Amino acid sequence: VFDFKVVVTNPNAISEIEDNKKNELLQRLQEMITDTSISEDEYNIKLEKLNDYYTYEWQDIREVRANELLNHYIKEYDIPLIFNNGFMDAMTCGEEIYQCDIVGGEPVIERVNPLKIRIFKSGYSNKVEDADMIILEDYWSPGRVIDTYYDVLSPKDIKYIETMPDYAGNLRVLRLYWKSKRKILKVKSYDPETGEEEWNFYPENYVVNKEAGEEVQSFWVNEAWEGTMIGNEIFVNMRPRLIQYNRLNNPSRCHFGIVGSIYNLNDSRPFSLVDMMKPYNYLYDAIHDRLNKAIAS
């Protein structure tokens, strides 16, 4: 059974901040319906629509949005089949990997070939999120690279794609993902109304507001970067990864789209199912070789 739903872990747990965000959203909807409704013709219709959202909560609205996204894209992409293929990969290799990316503005999910991903700088971790640097080398068609990088490919790059001899006529697409480091500032400020100390994180270019008690420190923090090379001459999308998989409290927590696991035992290399059935298969082949030679004679 495949029903992966986003659930609120503690649905009876509402706080003041959640209520404030809910109130903000309802005020914004009220402003929008006043803007769109043309002088009472459908204003009451909009009020009737948004009245039942008063009994909702912030966590409920977020959970509905997340479920909507996952529901639609699971039905659209046939994600269970992708997972079946990855499970086959895991039973052959002990390695199951998937990449999440934006292509053409929509989110997409793809199964990574275990032979075409080079994972560097991990700490005996069976999870693939924990790597600091991943290289994806694969051969794409010209149609795929133009589908994926039309809005950044220069005319010189497209002429390069034309002028290749095309003796398959695919292009080597090497994509580098690497955790760089950024300098960020931890600034300590006092709430003006109440004497309550407050903390914030800002980039290095932020100017600390002296004469207000703001004192600052400099930390070096992970940043996920990406860069793509097509053929040998094209250089595309060299920038901080626009999908920073961020966490609330830790500015250094980020990773790439690549997620996966090693089916190993205690920080070792994976002893897959095929590995533990292979010696028997070889013995079977040898003995059947003897059987065939006996049948011939």
């Binding site: 059974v1 992966f4 739903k5 659930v7 872990t9 747990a13 966590q59 959970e63």
Partner: peptide, 8 residues
């Protein structure tokens, strides 16, 4: 971080 987790 908001209390929402994919769960099966």
């Amino acid at each position: 971080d908001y209390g929402l987790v994919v769960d099966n």
